[PDB]
Design a protein around this motif. Sequence first.
Motif, PDB file in Angstrom:
ATOM      1  N   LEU A 115     -37.349 -40.966  34.802  1.00 31.29           N
ATOM      2  CA  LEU A 115     -38.047 -42.235  34.618  1.00 31.29           C
ATOM      3  C   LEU A 115     -37.064 -43.407  34.648  1.00 31.29           C
ATOM      4  N   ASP A 116     -36.052 -43.336  33.781  1.00 32.68           N
ATOM      5  CA  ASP A 116     -35.050 -44.402  33.635  1.00 32.68           C
ATOM      6  C   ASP A 116     -34.300 -44.648  34.929  1.00 32.68           C
ATOM      7  N   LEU A 117     -34.051 -43.575  35.664  1.00 30.76           N
ATOM      8  CA  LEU A 117     -33.370 -43.634  36.952  1.00 30.76           C
ATOM      9  C   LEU A 117     -34.113 -44.560  37.889  1.00 30.76           C
ATOM     10  N   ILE A 118     -35.381 -44.303  38.036  1.00 29.84           N
ATOM     11  CA  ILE A 118     -36.176 -45.043  38.962  1.00 29.84           C
ATOM     12  C   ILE A 118     -36.534 -46.419  38.413  1.00 29.84           C
ATOM     13  N   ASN A 119     -36.660 -46.549  37.092  1.00 29.00           N
ATOM     14  CA  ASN A 119     -36.911 -47.879  36.500  1.00 29.00           C
ATOM     15  C   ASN A 119     -35.723 -48.779  36.732  1.00 29.00           C
ATOM     16  N   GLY A 120     -34.540 -48.207  36.612  1.00 30.08           N
ATOM     17  CA  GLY A 120     -33.334 -48.934  36.892  1.00 30.08           C
ATOM     18  C   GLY A 120     -33.252 -49.273  38.352  1.00 30.08           C
ATOM     19  N   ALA A 121     -33.496 -48.273  39.191  1.00 30.81           N
ATOM     20  CA  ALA A 121     -33.490 -48.440  40.636  1.00 30.81           C
ATOM     21  C   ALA A 121     -34.429 -49.560  41.073  1.00 30.81           C
ATOM     22  N   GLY A 150     -51.834 -25.705  33.911  1.00 25.41           N
ATOM     23  CA  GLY A 150     -51.028 -25.028  32.907  1.00 25.41           C
ATOM     24  C   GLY A 150     -50.057 -25.978  32.256  1.00 25.41           C
ATOM     25  N   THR A 151     -49.419 -26.747  33.076  1.00 27.18           N
ATOM     26  CA  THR A 151     -48.509 -27.762  32.692  1.00 27.18           C
ATOM     27  C   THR A 151     -49.281 -28.935  32.086  1.00 27.18           C
ATOM     28  N   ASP A 152     -49.345 -29.001  30.776  1.00 32.65           N
ATOM     29  CA  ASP A 152     -49.968 -30.137  30.137  1.00 32.65           C
ATOM     30  C   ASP A 152     -48.976 -31.265  30.199  1.00 32.65           C
ATOM     31  N   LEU A 153     -49.214 -32.142  31.110  1.00 29.69           N
ATOM     32  CA  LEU A 153     -48.280 -33.165  31.449  1.00 29.69           C
ATOM     33  C   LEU A 153     -48.768 -34.509  30.938  1.00 29.69           C
ATOM     34  N   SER A 154     -50.055 -34.635  30.780  1.00 35.07           N
ATOM     35  CA  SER A 154     -50.616 -35.866  30.316  1.00 35.07           C
ATOM     36  C   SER A 154     -50.720 -35.880  28.791  1.00 35.07           C
ATOM     37  N   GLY A 155     -49.595 -36.103  28.137  1.00 36.82           N
ATOM     38  CA  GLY A 155     -49.574 -36.144  26.699  1.00 36.82           C
ATOM     39  C   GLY A 155     -48.170 -36.224  26.151  1.00 36.82           C
ATOM     40  N   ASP A 156     -47.444 -37.273  26.567  1.00 35.11           N
ATOM     41  CA  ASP A 156     -46.048 -37.538  26.144  1.00 35.11           C
ATOM     42  C   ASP A 156     -45.111 -36.452  26.677  1.00 35.11           C
ATOM     43  N   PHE A 157     -44.606 -36.686  27.860  1.00 33.59           N
ATOM     44  CA  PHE A 157     -43.863 -35.672  28.586  1.00 33.59           C
ATOM     45  C   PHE A 157     -42.450 -36.127  28.934  1.00 33.59           C
ATOM     46  N   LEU A 158     -41.934 -37.092  28.235  1.00 31.34           N
ATOM     47  CA  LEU A 158     -40.660 -37.667  28.609  1.00 31.34           C
ATOM     48  C   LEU A 158     -39.485 -36.811  28.146  1.00 31.34           C
ATOM     49  N   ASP A 159     -39.636 -36.134  27.030  1.00 31.56           N
ATOM     50  CA  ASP A 159     -38.534 -35.336  26.489  1.00 31.56           C
ATOM     51  C   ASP A 159     -38.785 -33.849  26.551  1.00 31.56           C
ATOM     52  N   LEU A 208     -42.620 -50.903  37.872  1.00 30.71           N
ATOM     53  CA  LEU A 208     -41.808 -49.979  37.091  1.00 30.71           C
ATOM     54  C   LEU A 208     -42.673 -48.811  36.651  1.00 30.71           C
ATOM     55  N   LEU A 209     -42.183 -47.600  36.868  1.00 29.34           N
ATOM     56  CA  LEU A 209     -42.938 -46.384  36.567  1.00 29.34           C
ATOM     57  C   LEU A 209     -43.345 -46.319  35.115  1.00 29.34           C
ATOM     58  N   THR A 210     -44.611 -46.152  34.900  1.00 30.99           N
ATOM     59  CA  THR A 210     -45.155 -45.973  33.599  1.00 30.99           C
ATOM     60  C   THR A 210     -45.243 -44.476  33.300  1.00 30.99           C
ATOM     61  N   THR A 211     -45.895 -44.122  32.225  1.00 28.94           N
ATOM     62  CA  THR A 211     -46.084 -42.747  31.877  1.00 28.94           C
ATOM     63  C   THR A 211     -47.061 -42.094  32.853  1.00 28.94           C
ATOM     64  N   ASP A 212     -48.197 -42.747  33.084  1.00 30.60           N
ATOM     65  CA  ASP A 212     -49.204 -42.224  34.012  1.00 30.60           C
ATOM     66  C   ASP A 212     -48.671 -42.157  35.412  1.00 30.60           C
ATOM     67  N   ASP A 213     -47.898 -43.157  35.813  1.00 26.89           N
ATOM     68  CA  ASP A 213     -47.410 -43.190  37.186  1.00 26.89           C
ATOM     69  C   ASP A 213     -46.361 -42.114  37.422  1.00 26.89           C
ATOM     70  N   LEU A 214     -45.493 -41.900  36.432  1.00 24.65           N
ATOM     71  CA  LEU A 214     -44.484 -40.849  36.525  1.00 24.65           C
ATOM     72  C   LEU A 214     -45.169 -39.483  36.540  1.00 24.65           C
TER      73      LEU A 214
END
Length: 86
Positions: free
Chosen positions: A75-81, A23-32, A4-10
């Motif tokens: 994330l949820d899409l693929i976790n569900g999948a 530029g895209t600071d993605l590694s620091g809570d990027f879910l919302d 199941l995709l984690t934060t790092d994996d996503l």
Amino acid sequence: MATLLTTDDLRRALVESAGETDGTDLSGDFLDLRFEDIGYDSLALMETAARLESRYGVSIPDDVAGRVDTPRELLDLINGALAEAA
């Protein structure tokens, strides 16, 4: 059975879709966060999805990948999948 995709994996997926992701600071809570802000096209989100499809063995329609407002939904899409995949 599938990881199941984690934060790092996503985050990995969101990198692979562009290749380089500066530029895209993605590694620091990027879910919302919004794709608009991270300069992400929903067309590129289909790339994100595709990366994970070919990797995990899931099936993600391109119409869906471009419909996700936040990475949370992606994330949820693929976790569900994955939960009904392996």
